[PDB]
Subunit: 295 residues, 4 copies
C-alpha cells in the first residue's frame, strides 16, 4: 500500500480582531472561523512514524493568530491568500495550503438613529466564506461564497409542466410559497500569486455585495417558473457584472410549505385561493444545484 493523498492541519480556529481608529474613536470588529490544511512531502509521517516532516497543528494555530496580528483580515480573500502563501514559502517541503474562512456578522448597532462607535449585533447567521487553495508553482485559486441567507416569498412562484408518469402525485401549481437557504459560490480566475491578489483587492467586497444584491433582487422580482429557472437568472447576472469570475455555483434547498385541508372541519376552506394557514415541512426537501460558466 501507498499514500495516494494526505492533508492535515487545524480546524475550527476562532479568531476575533478589533481595529481602533484613534482619530474618531470608532472601533470595528471582525470575527472568523479558520481552517488550514497542508499538503506536501509528508508521507513519511504516516508510513514511517517520521514526525520531523510535521509542522504541528498547534503551530498552525499559532501562525493563524500571528498572521492576523500582522496583516489586515479583510477582505477574507486577501487574508486567506496571505495565510496560505506563508506556509508554502516558509516550509520547503509543504507545497499546498488550503485555507477556509467563515466570516461571522457583527453589524454596527444604530442607537437613536446614529451608528454606535463600539457596539455590534449579530444580525443573522448568514456567512461570508472563502476557500483559498495556494499551490506552489500553480498560483492561488479562490472561491468566495455567501451561505445561510434564508428567504421566503409568499406568492409569484409557480411550478407546472413537469414530467408526469406513474410515480407522480404532485399537482401542478400557479401560485405557491417559495423558500430557500441560499448557498452561492463564485470562483475567481486563477491568480499568479499574492501581488496579483493584492492588485484586485477592491473587487472582493464589491463582488460579494453584487452577488448578494443580485440574489435578493432576482428572488424577489422573478415570477418564478421553478427554482432551476430563477437560480440560473441569478448566476447569469453575476457573471455579467464581474469579468474576473469564471463560474458561479448555486445550491438551493426547496423548503416546502404544505397546504392544510381543513374541509373535514365544518367545511372550512383553506386550500387553493383560500389557503391562509400552511404547515412548514422540516424534511424532506428539494435540493437544486447548478454551475454556470462562460460560453
Amino acid at each position: 500500500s501507498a499514500v495516494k493523498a494526505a492533508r492535515y492541519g487545524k480546524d475550527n480556529v476562532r479568531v476575533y480582531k478589533v481595529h481602533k481608529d484613534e482619530k474618531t474613536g470608532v472601533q470595528t470588529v471582525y470575527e472568523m472561523t479558520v481552517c488550514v490544511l497542508l499538503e506536501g512531502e509528508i508521507e513519511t509521517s504516516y508510513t514511517k512514524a517520521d514526525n520531523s516532516v510535521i509542522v504541528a497543528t498547534d503551530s498552525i494555530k499559532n501562525t493563524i493568530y500571528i498572521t492576523a496580528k500582522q496583516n489586515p483580515v479583510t477582505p477574507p480573500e486577501l487574508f486567506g491568500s496571505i495565510l496560505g502563501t506563508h506556509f508554502i514559502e516558509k516550509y520547503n517541503h509543504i507545497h499546498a495550503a488550503h485555507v477556509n474562512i467563515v466570516c461571522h456578522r457583527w453589524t454596527r448597532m444604530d442607537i437613536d438613529g446614529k451608528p454606535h462607535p463600539h457596539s455590534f449585533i449579530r444580525d443573522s447567521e448568514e456567512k461570508r466564506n472563502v476557500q483559498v487553495d495556494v499551490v506552489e508553482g500553480k498560483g492561488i485559486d479562490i472561491k468566495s461564497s455567501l451561505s445561510g441567507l434564508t428567504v421566503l416569498k409568499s406568492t409569484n412562484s409557480q411550478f407546472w409542466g413537469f414530467l408526469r408518469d406513474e410515480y407522480t402525485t404532485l399537482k401542478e401549481t400557479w401560485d405557491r410559497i417559495l423558500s430557500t437557504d441560499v448557498d452561492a459560490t463564485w470562483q475567481w480566475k486563477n491568480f499568479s500569486g499574492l501581488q496579483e491578489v493584492r492588485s484586485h483587492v477592491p473587487k472582493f467586497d464589491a463582488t460579494w455585495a453584487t452577488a448578494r444584491e443580485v440574489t435578493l433582487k432576482t428572488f424577489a422580482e422573478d415570477n418564478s417558473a421553478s427554482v432551476q429557472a430563477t437560480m440560473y437568472k441569478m448566476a447569469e447576472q453575476i457573471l455579467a457584472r464581474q469579468q474576473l469570475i469564471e463560474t458561479v455555483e448555486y445550491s438551493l434547498p426547496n423548503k416546502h410549505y404544505f397546504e392544510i385541508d381543513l374541509s373535514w372541519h365544518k367545511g372550512l376552506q383553506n386550500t387553493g385561493k383560500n389557503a391562509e394557514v400552511f404547515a412548514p415541512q422540516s424534511d424532506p426537501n428539494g435540493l437544486i444545484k447548478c454551475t454556470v460558466g462562460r460560453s
Copy 2:
C-alpha cells in the same frame, strides 16, 4: 403510588399564516412554533388505561391549525390566550392549558429602497416568545420574552473589585470585550380572561419593542461595571415604562473573548493596550440571572 402532576399535548407544531391585503396587494407572513400542554382530570389515562379522558395530541395539533385559520395570530400573547381558553372551555375535564409560542422572524425585504410586497428575509435567529398559562377559575398568566439577541461591545466594559481569595486567578480589568445572548422575560399582571387580554392588545407589541430598545440602548451606552450591574439597569427601565408588567427576568451568558499573549514570538505585543487579536471561547461561560420586581 399516585399521580402528583400530569400534563400532555403536542410540541413542535410549525405554523405559517399569510395575510393578503386585496387593496394594496401587500402580503404579510407569520411563522411560529407552538406547543400546547393540557392538565385536568386525566389521571385515569395513566393509572387505569382509560383513554376516554384523552383529547388526542393529534386533535390538539388540528385545533392549533383551525384556531390560526379563524383568528389573528398576532400579537402572540392574544393568539396564545385564545388557544388556551379554547381548551378549558371546550372540555369540561380539562382545567389548565399551557401554550408556548416561538415567533420566527420574516422581515420584509427592501429592494431598491422600497419595501417588497411579498418577499421576506430571516434577519437573525432572534425570537419573540410567549408562555400563556390559562387556568380555569384563575385567569390567564402571560410571560413574554425575546431570546437569541446576540450582541458584543469591544470596549466600555470593566470588571474589577471582586472577591479575591486562594481560588482566584482572574485579573482585574478596566477594559474588556463584553458579549452575550440576551434572554429577557417580562411577566404581565394576571388577566381575568380573554376580554381583559383583548383590552390590552396594543400594549403587547409596544412593550416588546420597548424591551428590545431598552436592552440595546443600555447595553451600548452603559460603561459597564459588570454584567450584573448592566442588566439591572435594563430591567429597571422596562418596569418604569410599563405598569402592567410585574417582573422582568434576564438570563445572560458572559461569552468570553481571551487575550492572546504573542510575546514569545519576536516580542510581539498583543495584550492590554496592545490587544488586537483575541480568541473567542466556546466554553465555559459565565451565566448571570436576575429577576427584578416592584418595591
Copy 3:
C-alpha cells in the same frame, strides 16, 4: 424596583478525570459538563455596582477543577453535594449553590472478548445527570436523571378509545410503532448534609441502574395502551424498589412514524396489516409528562 431573585455562576465547564490503578494497570475515565450557580447576599452587585460580594465565575471554574482533583467524581450525586457544600461553607454571604452535572458515556472497549485497560467508546448520547441544590440550613436536595435514551418498538403498542369530537381525525389503532426519547428523573428525600449523602453512596449507582433497567424492560414488555399507561407502570416500579425516592418524573416525546399509502401506484398495499415502509416524522411530536409520588 428591587431584586426579587438572583443567581449567577459558570456554565458549560467540561471536566475529564482519569483514575489509574497501579496494581492492575487499568485506567477508568470520567467526563462531565458542570454548571454551578450561586445565590446569597449579592443584590448589591446588581443595584450598586458593588463587586465585593462577587465570587468571580472564573474562580468558580477553578474551584470545580480543584474539587475534582481532591475528591472522587463518582457517583455524581456525591461529587455535586461536595461541590455545592464547599461554596456555602467557604463564603459567609453565599447561602445556596445549585450544581448541575451531565455525565457523558465513556464505555470500556472489548477487544477480542477482553476488556481493554485504557480504551473507551462513546456508546450513545444517553446521559446520566444530577441536579443538586445545597441550601444553608435546609440540607441537600438531589434530583437524579437519565436522558437521551432513545428506543423504538415495532409492534405491541395500541391507541384506541380516546375522545372523538369535531376536532378529531386520528384513527384508532391496535398495532402501531412506539418510539421515544426517555427523560426520567427521581427525586431523593432531602438529606441533612454531606454526612448523610455519604452514608447513602452505594444507593446512587444502584438506583440509576434500576431506573434504567425498569424503563427498558417495561417498554419492551408492556402491551402498551398509551404512552401515559406505560410510563406510569415504569414510575410505579421504581418507587417500589427504592424507599429513599420521593417522586419519579417522566417526560416522553411520542416520535411518530406514519403509514404511507402507496395504493395510488399499481394498487400497492402498504397500510394496516400490509404496512412495511413508514415515514418517520421529525415534527410535530406528542409530549407526555407525569410525576408519580407515594399515596
Copy 4:
C-alpha cells in the same frame, strides 16, 4: 453563459422499513435517511423554463418509498444501486443518479439476557453510510463508510520529534490522551451494473464489520506515534483484507484534552505524571486526513 454542471433531487428523505418473520415472530427494523440527485439532459429547465425535462423531486421521494417497498433495503450498497439504476433506466434523458444513504442504528434490546423480538435501542449516533454513483454506460461506483464513531484512549499515545521553529510552542510528549471521531470510507472497484453488485452482496456487511473491527483494535492496541501513523496502520489492514477495495480514506479530528496546572493553588500537582484532571477543548481541533491505495 452556459450550464457547466447541474444536479437536482430530494434530500433528507427519512425511511423506516420493518421485516416480520411469521415463523419466529421476530421483527427487524431499518431506518435510513436518503438523498437522490439526478443529472442528464436537463439544462433547458434552467435556461428556458422548460419543466418537461424535470422528474419532480416529489416523484423522486415517492420512488424512494416504492423502491423500499419492493426491494430489500439491506445492505445499503445494494439498495442504493437498485435505486440509482432505476432512474437511469426509467428515464431516457437522465444519465446519472447519485444516491447517499445514512443508516441509523436500531440495535435489538436484550431483556433478561434474551434478544427481544421487537424492541430496539439507538446505541450511539455512529452511522453506516453509502454513496452510490450510477452513471449510464460507466457502471456503478460505490463508496461505503462509517462515521460518528467516537473513541478515547487515556494513555499509549505520544507525540514528539515534530518540526520546531519560531512558530512552535507545543511541548513534546510521551504520554497523552488521544480522542477522535472516526470517519472511514472504503471505495469499491467499479461495478459493471446491478448484476455484478448482486454477486458481491455478502462482501458489503462483512467489509463494514472488518473496517469497524480493524479501526477499534488498531486504535486500542497501537502505541501511537501520531494520529498520522495510527490511521495509516488501519487503512493498510483494511486493504489487505478485502481485494475488491481500491482505496481507504480516513478523516480524523484530534480532539484535545489539555492539562490543567493547579500549582498556583497550594502547590497542587496536576501535570505530567501527576495529571488527573483535564480540560476537554471544544475547539480548535487538529484534522488529519489520508487516502491509502495499492502500490
